[PDB]
């Protein structure tokens, strides 16, 4: 029933808002709906976990796109979606 709390690092390893998520990657979802969200040159964002001393680095942006295959009516050829890899994984002291 707990989702687990994160917390965004900045350029220089230091901090903001608390973010959640069940997973790193929510937490990186909404890191990625977060501002130079490009998938030329995605907005780098740095995780933290508020448990373990791993700090989840993600790769965040967003593509508002997703044409229909099978999509609803309302649901156009696209869509507002934030999309976040991991692209390795950073260390807590």
Known sequence: SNTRNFVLRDEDGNEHGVFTGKQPRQAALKAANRGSG???????????????????????????????????????????????KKERIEKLE
Not at 53 to 63: C, N, R, S, Y
């Open 38 to 84: 490009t998938k030329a040159n995605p907005d780098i964002i740095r995780l933290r976990e508020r448990g373990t001393k791993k700090v989840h680095v993600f790769k965040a942006w967003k593509e508002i796109v997703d044409a229909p295959k099978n999509r609803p009516a309302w649901m156009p050829e696209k869509i507002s979606k934030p999309f976040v």
